[PDB]
Amino acid sequence: SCGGSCFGGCWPGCSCYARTCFRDGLP
Numbered sequence: 001s002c003g004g005s006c007f008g009g010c011w012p013g014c015s016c017y018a019r020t021c022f023r024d025g026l027p
Contacts, residue, residue, distance in 0.1 A: 001027045 002014035002021035010021035017023075 002011035002023065004011040004014070004021055006016040006019055006021070010016045014021045014023045014026060
């Protein structure tokens, strides 16, 4: 559950995975 864009960095506390923002604990 992270917004932002991969072209300009993912949301705070997330990463750019699969051309999208996603991370354990924060879908």
